[PDB]
């Protein structure tokens, strides 16, 4: 295989990483949330060898002065030139002060910032965040929506509209540990409580003047039990799969994974089930192009297993580092992998997916 390693500045301690897959115009953008801000990189095809025909170039560093735990690009990100070029960025993040912020930037200069914290925001630590752009029928930018879930047993829906902000708070039966809007349908989203509950949720259900949020799945009782998943199988992750949001993949801390599918007829059980070799503290990161594929990590010993849901996998571990893995994500092309460890970021190419 072929890996290229690129050093984060030695004083930069990473906490999260992510690609801008949500926006095709800046899909070569890589963000690193650290203890003082967010660092932006760009991925580019050198001639290289046609082994890893992709290299990373460090663009710039947006200082914020405080830890960035989670990070999400929006579809509003753009690129421009004056010939010199300018990047217009939209970043949703979580800071040390238990606040949830939306920072809008022009390159490294921070031009705008909205903050949601204190008692109005989450009343405990924030665990996960995601963002989506909502347009009207006339197709102007109507709303920017940021959703967050917390250890205050709360899902907070945050709306930023032309006429200003709209805050909404909702209860959960347990801490919220994961959350994500549904692809091709921003009207819906999915919520991931700690206890193993999975919420399918329509946030447009009330306007001006009757229905609950929609659906609730649960992984804890569905564990195959052919091999006991252990006493504490805390839900680590829940993610939509497909370009229409036609699927759901759930992952425990134990490594046990489950898939459901969303289109025909009536349904009585999770469509497929399985188990990873190692715990998945970070959960799974679904492949952007092959619905059957996702990646999990033994973050303490620095390994990454690749799993196929229809068992085409047969245990494929294309990635083995000698150091702890802090975070990771798939480049849009689907063959490259971007991985952040405590001092570096690696871009690795798996020849099999090109």
């Amino acid at each position: 295989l072929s890996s290229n390693q690129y050093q984060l500045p030695l004083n930069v301690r990473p906490y999260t990483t992510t690609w801008c897959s949500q926006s095709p115009s800046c899909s070569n953008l890589l963000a690193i949330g650290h203890d003082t801000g967010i660092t932006i990189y760009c991925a580019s095809e050198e001639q290289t060898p046609g082994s890893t025909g992709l290299t990373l170039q460090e663009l710039f560093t947006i200082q914020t002065g405080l830890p960035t735990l989670h990070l999400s690009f929006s579809s509003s990100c753009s690129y421009s030139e004056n010939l010199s070029p300018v990047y217009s960025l939209f970043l949703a993040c979580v800071c040390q002060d238990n606040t949830v912020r939306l920072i809008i930037t022009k390159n490294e200069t921070i031009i705008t910032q909205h903050v949601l914290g204190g008692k109005s925001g989450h009343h405990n630590f924030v665990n996960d965040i995601d963002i989506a752009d909502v347009y009207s029928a006339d197709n102007r930018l109507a709303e920017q929506v940021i959703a967050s879930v917390g250890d205050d047993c709360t899902l907070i829906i945050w709306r930023l509209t032309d006429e200003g902000p709209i805050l909404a708070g909702y209860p959960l039966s347990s801490p919220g540990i994961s959350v994500q809007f549904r692809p091709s349908n921003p009207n819906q989203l999915i919520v991931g409580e700690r206890n193993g509950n999975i919420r399918i949720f329509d946030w447009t259900l009330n306007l001006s003047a009757k229905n609950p949020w929609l659906l609730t799945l649960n992984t804890l009782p569905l564990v195959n039990t052919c091999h006991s998943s252990g006493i504490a199988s805390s839900l680590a992750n829940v993610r939509w799969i497909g370009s229409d949001g036609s699927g759901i993949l759930a992952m425990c801390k134990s490594g046990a994974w489950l898939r459901w599918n969303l289109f025909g007829p009536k349904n009585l059980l999770p469509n497929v089930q399985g188990i990873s070799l190692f715990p998945s503290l970070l959960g799974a990161c679904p492949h952007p192009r092959y619905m059957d594929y996702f990646a999990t990590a033994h973050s303490q010993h620095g390994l990454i297993q690749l799993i196929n849901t229809y068992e085409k996998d047969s245990n494929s571990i294309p990635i083995q580092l000698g150091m702890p893995i802090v975070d990771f994500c798939w480049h849009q092309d689907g063959s490259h992998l971007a991985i952040a460890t405590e001092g570096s970021v690696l871009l690795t190419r798996l020849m099999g997916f090109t």
Partner: protein, 920 residues
């Protein structure tokens, strides 16, 4: 009359506090001989038998179709009267269709039991106490010897009665009494065989069910040394000497319409100590009696003197409902002949009444008897709590119902039966039955339950555009789990049954035997008496304030279910977050949350009129409620057993739920009053009440904290490293609390619950939140996962903080654990009142020969960060240690620089100023 109350024991929770379950067989050759049928006949308990001796220990026996069963429910104080396991003895045929086959007597540190199969054989089994204590599977001896002493074929036995370890008596329908001597490879036998049947008068009207006018109805045994008491079919009182094997005394009681009444099983006689009593119902009058005989044994011959006439009944049994004396036992106070207490059990079908009669006499030929009453009834909380699952406080649907079956926590194998009966899909039983027996493990049960439920309810789509009709899933799920739990309630409207009662000398406790559901008798607690809403009864039973309490209880009962859901969520949000706001303005805000329910302004003003008419509300309320705090004594514990912890768990879930009720009541009122006319509220004509409001809210936090705590049974023996420490080594939850809070003239259970409830009530005196104490200690052993939501709940305190830290560590979500570590410190070190975690920081402080303000703590945090194996945060903290040192010790500075050196060795390299600028 005064009331009494029961305390029910789920058999599965027994199986919780009992790690293993062993099954023994015995030599079986010659032994004489569709779903709902097999399910009904699956479990029952043909009879129930419970014994205990003067020496030490105590067990209970459950009977079964083709099967015998037994377990350990003792409350003792030994080295290991706590580590327990359950015993299943298989039989070639059942233990007779009748109440016979049971006997228990000991000898020396062992238990010897006598049994009878359906047909014609005896069983003699010797079980070691050690055998009981050990989890081990192995036995190395001949535990049992079956034998047929006399021919039971000729004369079938109707009554069995032990006298000693070697010897045991049997009584036949014919009327003869045999005595059976056993020994290893030996058996010698004895008799007082009697056959009893003019001939013209026996030619006609002769046909009847088989009888023999020298039969004995029920025998009883009392040792001064060796004496028996007997009641015959001739209805003569015969007294028996063991040495003689002959009737020492005879008394003639002349009743003709009395033998006309014949009962299956039933104990016609029982006993206190040296004296003994018995009684005859006198048929439909239901009069019964107490003929407590005093047997004055003289050297020439043992003498008999009966001293009392008749004891009246209660009259609630009517409507042709057949009252039936199930069993009774007579127990007097050995302290002094001032009182005598008889315990009596009545049953009609599945339903049951229980009562105790206390006679206080000394010289009076009069009859001074206090009576207690009990009520057994079924109140269905089912049908209405089902409809609304709209809020995510307890979202989805299924999980809630599951938590309802767990909230009941009183019915057991009925569930299993139902589960693997619904999963059949018109499948049989004979093979699926074994599939029921196989599962065993409880944690997985619920998983199997949900997996089976979802596999039965088809989700029909909405037919709009690849959409689904959740609104059908609604009714489907509701009526599904409803029908299910209705079959459940029907499997304990067939199961919940009582059979016997057995008093214990060593423990002095009011034991009870229900079919497959052990229980206990207890006096009404104040909360119970005031939750009955006995307003009219209290009237029937300086006097103000109580009508407000009852009417108010009604007011709480007025609210809906989703209402209490919202309320529970809101208070759950009021555990941690509330102290941040200005404390006394939220008062009116809570009523501002109370307008959303019905709350007709008519009801409001109707109450307001009462309020304005109050003399002086606060000065009566605060005091009269302050008088509710109980009297705990000693609070020191011996090595405690397991029935202790589990039974106290169930009873405490009941009491705590009623407490949540009464408290919620109290608050709801307190702000339903002080809402409108705000200016007049602040006029201070009333005493005001904000302080006691706050105090009460502390109380509620604790109460609902436990109410949650008795719902997380988590334990495991991965390491399996293991007294009361072994009590924590038992699985059930909430126990640890009771073991933490385990006698002069009072039963142990009551007092050992009293100490707990007292440690709860006490507020400022303890100077510590009981929650912080709990998780502080409990964290150490187990439950590492539950204390996550539990620490996310617990109130912010330094203790609570460092625990938040260590827990957020055990889950290895470093970040937030680290934010907890950062945002706090220690002024608490060298206090030692904190358990088994302070000693670390303190040893560390002393290692620097002094008590440095801070750097030491940070050092401790660096080493602990090593314990997490995560080395980078140690790189962070070792620095803080190295810096904020305000002490300038040589040794200390050296040590700190050293640990900094190690953490650096975990991630150092060449680049100098590149480890100077990275924290957080």
């Amino acid at each position: 009359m005064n009331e009494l109350k029961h305390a029910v024991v789920p058999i599965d929770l027994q199986s919780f506090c009992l790690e293993g379950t062993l099954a023994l067989w015995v030599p079986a050759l010659e032994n004489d001989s569709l779903f709902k049928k097999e399910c009904v006949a699956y479990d029952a308990g043909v009879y129930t038998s419970n014994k205990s001796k003067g020496s030490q220990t105590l067990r209970w026996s459950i009977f079964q179709n083709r099967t015998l069963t037994i377990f350990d429910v003792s409350l003792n104080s030994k080295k290991e009267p706590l580590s327990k396991f359950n015993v299943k003895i298989h039989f070639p045929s059942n233990v007779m269709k009748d109440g016979v086959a049971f006997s228990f007597s000991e000898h020396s540190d062992t238990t010897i039991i006598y049994a009878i199969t359906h047909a014609r054989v005896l069983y003699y089994i010797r079980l070691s106490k050690t055998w009981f204590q050990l989890p081990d599977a192995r036995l190395d001896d001949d535990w049992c010897l079956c034998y047929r002493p006399i021919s039971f074929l000729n004369q079938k036995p109707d009554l069995m009665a032990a006298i000693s370890t070697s010897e045991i008596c049997v009584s036949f329908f014919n009327g003869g009494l045999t005595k059976i001597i056993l020994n290893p490879k030996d058996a010698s036998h004895y008799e007082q065989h009697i056959d009893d049947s003019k001939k013209y008068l026996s030619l006609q009207a002769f046909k009847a069910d088989y009888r023999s006018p020298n039969t004995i109805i029920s025998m009883i045994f009392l040792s001064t040394y060796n004496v028996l008491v007997m009641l015959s079919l001739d209805y003569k009182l015969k007294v028996l000497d063991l040495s003689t094997n002959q009737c020492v005394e005879t008394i003639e009681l002349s009743q003709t319409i009395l033998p006309l009444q014949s009962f299956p099983y039933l104990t016609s006689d029982h006993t206190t100590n040296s004296f003994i009593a018995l009684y005859y119902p006198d048929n439909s009058h239901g009069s019964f009696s107490i003929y407590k005989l005093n047997a004055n044994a003289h050297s020439f011959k043992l003498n008999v003197v009966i001293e009392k006439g008749i004891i009246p009944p209660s009259l609630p049994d009517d409507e042709f409902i057949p009252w039936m004396l199930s069993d009774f036992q007579l127990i007097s106070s050995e302290g002094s002949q001032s009182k005598f207490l008889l315990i009596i059990a009545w049953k009609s079908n599945l339903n049951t009444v229980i009562q105790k009669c206390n006679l206080s006499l000394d010289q009076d030929e009069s009859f001074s008897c206090v009576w207690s009453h009990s009520l057994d009834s079924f109140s269905l909380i089912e049908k209405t709590f089902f409809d609304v699952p709209t809020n995510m406080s307890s979202g989805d649907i299924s999980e809630i119902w599951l938590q309802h079956i767990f909230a009941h926590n009183t019915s057991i194998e009925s569930i299993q039966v139902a589960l693997l009966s619904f999963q059949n899909s018109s499948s049989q039983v004979s093979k699926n039955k074994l599939d029921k027996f196989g599962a065993l493990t409880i944690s997985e049960l619920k998983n199997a339950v949900l997996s089976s439920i979802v596999s039965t309810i088809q989700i029909e789509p909405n037919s709009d555009l690849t959409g689904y009709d959740y609104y059908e899933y609604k009714r489907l799920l509701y009526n599904e789990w409803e029908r299910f739990a209705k079959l459940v309630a029907y499997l304990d409207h067939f199961g919940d049954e009582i059979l016997s009662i057995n008093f214990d000398p060593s423990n002095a406790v009011t034991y009870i035997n229900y079919a497959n559901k052990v229980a206990f008798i207890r006096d009404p607690y104040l909360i119970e008496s005031f939750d009955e809403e006995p307003l009219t009864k209290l009237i029937s039973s300086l006097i103000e304030g109580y009508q407000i309490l009852d009417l108010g209880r009604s007011l709480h009962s007025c609210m809906s279910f989703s209402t209490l859901s919202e309320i529970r969520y809101s208070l759950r949000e009021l555990v941690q977050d509330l102290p941040s706001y200005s404390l006394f303005d939220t008062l009116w805000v809570f009523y501002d949350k109370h307008i959303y329910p019905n709350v007709d302004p008519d009801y409001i003003s109707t109450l307001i009129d009462t309020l304005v008419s109050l003399e002086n509300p606060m000065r009566d309320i605060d005091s009269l409620i302050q008088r509710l705090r109980s009297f705990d004594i000693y609070n020191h514990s011996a090595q405690s057993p397991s029935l202790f912890l589990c039974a106290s768990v169930a009873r405490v879930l009941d009491s705590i739920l009623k407490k949540f009720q009464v408290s919620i009541e109290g608050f709801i009122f307190l702000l339903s009053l002080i809402t409108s006319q705000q200016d007049y509220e602040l006029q201070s004509k009333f005493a005001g009440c904000d302080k006691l409001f706050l105090s009460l809210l502390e109380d509620w936090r604790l109460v609902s904290f436990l109410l949650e705590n008795s719902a997380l049974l988590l334990e495991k023996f991965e390491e399996e490293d293991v007294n009361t420490m072994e009590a924590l080594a038992s699985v059930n939850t909430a126990l640890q609390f009771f073991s933490a809070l385990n006698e002069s003239q009072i039963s142990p259970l009551h007092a050992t619950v009293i100490s707990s409830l007292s440690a709860i009530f006490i507020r400022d005196d303890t100077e510590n939140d009981l929650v912080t104490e709990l998780v502080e200690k409990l964290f150490l052993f187990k439950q590492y996962n539950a204390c996550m939501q539990l620490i996310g709940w617990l109130n912010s305190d330094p203790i609570a903080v460092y625990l938040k830290a260590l827990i957020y560590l055990k889950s290895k979500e470093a970040v937030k654990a680290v934010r907890c570590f950062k945002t706090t410190s220690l002024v608490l070190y060298s206090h030692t009142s904190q358990f088994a975690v302070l000693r670390e920081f303190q040893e560390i402080a002393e290692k620097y020969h002094h008590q440095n303000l801070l750097s030491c703590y940070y050092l401790h945090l660096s080493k602990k960060l090593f314990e997490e194996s995560a080395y980078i945060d140690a790189l962070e903290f070792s620095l803080l240690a190295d810096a904020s040192k305000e002490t300038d010790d040589e040794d200390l500075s050296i040590a700190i620089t050293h640990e900094t050196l190690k953490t650096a060795c975990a991630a150092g390299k060449f680049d100098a100023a590149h480890v100077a600028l990275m924290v957080l």
